[PDB]
Design a protein around this nucleic acid. Structure first.
Lengths: 81, 212, 77, 184, 45, 168, 134
RNA sequence: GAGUCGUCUCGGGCGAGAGCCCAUAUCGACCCCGAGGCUUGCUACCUCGCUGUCGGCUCUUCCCAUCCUGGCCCUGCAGC
RNA sequence: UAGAAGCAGCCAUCCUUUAAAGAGUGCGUAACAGCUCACCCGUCGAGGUCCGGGGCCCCGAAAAUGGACGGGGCUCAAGC
């Protein structure tokens, strides 16, 4: 599994919490997670910190920022979780 | 064997002569072709090299007006173990010239025969011996007359698409019959805006008078 | 929003002999590259990261690489 | 090590062959019979993307690629197996002895090999049919793997290495697999 | 004579080092140390 | 000549200086240069020693022979120049002992355990040139093979290998 | 090999041993006695040497015509140079070296035998033969 | 007895050369590297308020680098 | 030298003509032949063949009352 725009959650990382989305895939061993700062998500590197996919999928660009990663995340309705 | 040194030398060459042909130098020796290659010099032409640089009739065409290259043309007639033959000789002469000069070509044991192979009737000039026995075995009837071994009649020993058994090949070879071609088989000839194929180029002039 | 493939240039001394390396890894900051390079080199060549000398680290564009292997990998990210 | 990030290879499947996937387990059914295998290797998922079968793993390593292409080749043997089947033709060649090759039941028996009073037998598998016609015998069946095994079980039964190997050549040998093996 | 039978039997090469019967044109041995092996189990000419 | 188990070390000291000591052994090597002068070639291949050792006079003669023999036969002595630069100088020592058993020792601890001369050896450190052969690029493949054959008879090993100088 | 077949080598000007000639046979259609008279005459040199030749007879008319595996080029240099034997050691010893003019002449007649091309090519074909002693 | 392992046993590499042509079926110099502890030697660690010598006999266990037996590979393996 | 005809061996190893051609790779005769290669235009239409350092794991690696990394057992580790 794990492709871009597939919405995620974790039990580890900064918080944790918390729901996060894969916005770019760094290497074959690292992924870049970000989210809205409305859920107190910030950009960070991860390398499987229990990253488990949710059923949800949305469309974001390959290399993006939270106003365009915000915008799809919103209409899905998961910026409040 | 520099790129654009070697193509360049072919470049000037193709432009130099009215007639450019692609020929299968493959079927040959080396005795047929090295003698052919000398022959070709004596008969106002020369034969040449190059690997992708053979398909590169394109630069020469681009340099002039025509429609011999890869581009405008039909389907680059080029085949494996092809060579390029540039000459003053007319394409029909070129094809006939290639056909006459050749020696010789036996059919090879276990090989697929390119065309029907025939024997002519007459005495072999060979003495009686096991050789008679051999002819009968291959499918050629024979007898002793005038003290010599003779082939009874004309016959097609094998048809085209059929393999030649080794026994048949050896006997045919003994007889000095050489049905196969190991001259240069001509893939195609370009002259003055037209590409001529081997089927067009093969004219049996006498056959046309017979047909009528 | 930032990825970039970071072209590390350096040398390591092992047994008084000098190996070149250009190790291109993508992260988003130089600190990832530094940890990653000390770890990769040090694991495999069997050498500490106090005998690793980094000459340089230069980010180049991540639609580029100057190895076949790195570029081909990064085409999809 | 060849390096891609997918890493992904793709198997072209005709209209004659339908493939069904259930994890790592593959069943291939065409106009004639079915055949099942388990493809086992860590991290290689086989699934159907439209008409096309995809065999993939995230990570490229050298071991993986080899195994991945073997699985592609097993599919491919099924596509021409399940359509029309595989034929290998074999000859029983004898040095001295009229050597009697008969199928009695689900074993092939070869008798009178080297003047022997004893029967030789070799196992035939549930998808494979052995027909003998004179001293040609053709082994015929749905599957290449299976067909290849049955033929070779026959050969391994006639095996002789307890005497000279230039002056006893008694046995049934592979004239054909699917090409013609071989020139020395 | 020769051609199906003498192919599996005959035409093969053999390992100088360990005596293993290997294929007719393989570069390295199977198991015995990378030697460049010999032809053949001959005696016919 | 006892097996080499002392010619494999350099942690054993010097006792070279043949004039100084009473009793010195003969050589076994006489021939060291062969072929054409070394001014008629361009390229230089060496075999480089990666390990410190003492290399016996016997090993030097043997190794050179098996190598030079191969070069001579295939190439001819109209081409190549081959040199093994070293001369062995290090004198080698022996404790007297043989079978005699029973009440007899043989022996003996001391009562002069100090060497009678066995032989001579050449001291080879790290990055020395044990062999230098001179060749053209036609004659490359022969020089490498010959060097491989040398390396086994080297007391320890090589680890710098068959080296292209290139000819500077 | 070889095959002992119609090709056989007989030394210089001689003929009729039982043993090379009888078994090998050179038929005219008659016996060898005709062949004997041909072979010795052409080959006339004060010495003998193994001269490759071929004969053609199928048991029939049984007439023979032979070739001379010698006269090729190795003898041609012997007249012009004026030295009979070839050199025991090539490159090592050059017994003689033909001048350029003598080479052109050797090539000139040699043309039909040869596939030599222009006159330069022929000479080149000949020169390479010149160097080899033994 | 332990330690050691020059010697001893066995094993590996390289392959000069011979074997009809053919290094490697077989035979194998020069030289080089290992394993064992079964011969000898070195050692003096243990024992001189005595752990009784050899050989044999009798009785029993173990090791394989295997003489046969079984199952095998090569061959200059025709058969035997 | 019987023969040495590319192919016991020694030495020269050159020159012409070009898909291309080594005074020839192996087989084959003991030695003309025959099978064949390097080689080459060339079809399938690519990311390819080299060589050379390094880490690590494999072979090399057989022993004597019971074998053991302390033991168990461990294999994305409880290892390196």
């Amino acid at each position: 599994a794990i492709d871009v725009g597939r919405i995620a959650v974790v039990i580890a990382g900064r918080r944790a919490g918390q729901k996060v989305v894969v916005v770019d895939i760094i290497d074959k061993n690292f992924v870049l997670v970000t989210g809205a700062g409305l859920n107190k998500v910030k950009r960070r590197r991860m390398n499987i910190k229990h990253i488990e996919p949710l059923p949800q999928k949305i469309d974001i660009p390959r290399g993006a920022s939270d106003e365009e990663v915000r915008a799809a995340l919103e209409k899905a309705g998961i910026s409040l979780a | 064997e520099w790129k654009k040194k070697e193509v360049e030398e072919l470049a000037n060459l193709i432009k130099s002569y009215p007639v450019v042909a692609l020929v299968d130098v493959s079927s040959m020796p080396a005795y047929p072709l090295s003698q052919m290659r000398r022959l070709i010099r004596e008969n106002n032409g020369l034969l040449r090299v190059s690997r992708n640089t053979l398909i590169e009739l394109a630069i020469k065409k681009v340099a002039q007006e025509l429609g011999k290259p890869e581009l405008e043309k039909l389907i680059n007639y080029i085949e494996g173990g092809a060579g390029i033959l540039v000459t003053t000789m007319n394409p029909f002469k070129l094809y006939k010239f290639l056909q006459q000069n050749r020696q010789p070509a036996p059919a090879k044991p276990g090989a697929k025969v390119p065309k029907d192979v025939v024997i002519p009737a007459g005495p072999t000039s060979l003495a009686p011996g096991p050789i008679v026995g051999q002819m009968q075995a291959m499918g050629i009837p024979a007898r002793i007359e005038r003290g010599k071994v003779t082939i009874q009649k004309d016959t097609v020993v094998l048809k085209a698409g059929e393999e030649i058994t080794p026994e048949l090949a050896n006997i045919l070879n003994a007889l000095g019959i050489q049905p196969l071609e190991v001259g240069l088989d001509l893939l195609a000839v370009y002259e003055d805006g037209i590409i001529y194929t081997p089927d067009v180029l093969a004219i049996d002039e006498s056959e046309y008078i017979n047909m009528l | 929003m930032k990825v970039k493939v970071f072209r590390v240039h350096g040398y390591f001394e092992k047994n008084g002999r000098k190996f070149k390396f250009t190790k291109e890894y993508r992260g988003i900051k130089e600190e990832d590259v530094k940890e990653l390079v000390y770890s990769d080199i040090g694991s495999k060549h069997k050498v500490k990261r106090n005998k690793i000398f980094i000459k340089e680290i230069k980010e180049i564009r991540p639609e580029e690489a100057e190895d076949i292997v790195v570029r081909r990998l990064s085409l999809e990210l | 090590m060849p390096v891609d990030a997918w890493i992904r290879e793709e198997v072209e499947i005709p209209e004659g062959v339908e493939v069904t996937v259930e994890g790592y387990k593959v069943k291939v059914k065409g106009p004639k019979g079915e055949l099942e295998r388990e493809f086992f290797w860590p991290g290689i998922q086989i699934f159907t993307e439209d008409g096309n079968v995809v065999i993939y793993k995230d990570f490229p390593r050298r071991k993986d690629v080899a195994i991945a292409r073997t699985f592609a080749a097993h599919i491919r043997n099924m596509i021409k197996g399940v359509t029309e089947g595989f034929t290998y033709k074999l000859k029983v060649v004898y040095s001295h002895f009229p050597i009697s090759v008969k199928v009695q039941g689900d074993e092939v028996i070869i008798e009178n090999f080297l003047g022997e009073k004893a029967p030789r037998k070799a196992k035939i598998l549930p998808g494979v049919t052995v027909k003998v016609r004179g001293q040609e015998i053709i082994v015929e069946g749905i599957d290449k793997e299976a067909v290849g095994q049955t033929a070779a079980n026959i050969e391994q039964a006639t095996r002789i290495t307890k005497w000279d190997r230039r002056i006893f050549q008694d046995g049934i040998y592979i004239v054909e697999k699917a090409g013609k093996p071989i020139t020395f | 004579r020769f051609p199906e039978a003498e192919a599996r039997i005959f035409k093969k090469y053999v390992c100088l080092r360990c005596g293993a019967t290997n294929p007719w044109g393989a570069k390295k041995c199977r198991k015995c140390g990378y030697k460049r092996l010999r032809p053949k189990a001959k005696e016919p000419r | 000549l006892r097996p080499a188990k002392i010619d494999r070390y350099v942690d054993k000291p010097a006792y070279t200086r043949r004039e100084y000591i009473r009793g010195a052994p003969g050589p076994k090597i006489t021939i060291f240069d062969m072929g054409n002068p070394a001014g008629d070639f361009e390229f230089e291949v060496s075999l480089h020693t990666a390990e410190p050792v003492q290399i016996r006079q016997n090993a030097l003669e043997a190794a050179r022979q098996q190598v030079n023999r191969y070069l001579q036969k295939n190439v001819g002595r109209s081409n190549y120049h081959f040199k093994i630069r070293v001369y062995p100088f290090q004198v080698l020592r022996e404790n007297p002992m043989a079978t005699g058993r029973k009440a007899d020792r043989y022996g003996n601890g001391m009562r002069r355990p100090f060497g009678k001369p066995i032989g001579l050896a050449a001291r080879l450190k790290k990055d020395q040139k044990i062999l230098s052969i001179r060749v053209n690029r036609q004659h490359l493949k022969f020089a490498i093979e010959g060097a491989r054959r040398a390396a086994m008879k080297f007391p320890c090993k090589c680890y710098y290998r068959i080296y292209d100088k290139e000819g500077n | 090999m070889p095959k002992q077949v119609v090709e056989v080598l007989v030394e210089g000007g001689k003929a009729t041993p039982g043993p090379p000639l009888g078994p090998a046979i050179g038929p005219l259609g008659l016996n060898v006695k005709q062949v004997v008279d041909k072979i010795n005459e052409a080959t006339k040199d004060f010495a003998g040497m193994q001269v490759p030749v071929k004969i053609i007879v199928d048991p029939v008319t049984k007439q023979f015509e032979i070739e001379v595996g010698v006269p090729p080029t190795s003898q041609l240099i012997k007249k012009e140079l004026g030295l009979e034997k070839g050199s025991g050691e090539p490159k090592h010893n050059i017994v003689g070296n033909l001048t350029m003019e003598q080479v052109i002449k050797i090539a000139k007649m040699k043309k039909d035998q040869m596939l030599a091309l222009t006159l330069k090519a022929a000479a080149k074909e000949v020169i390479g033969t010149a160097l080899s002693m033994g």
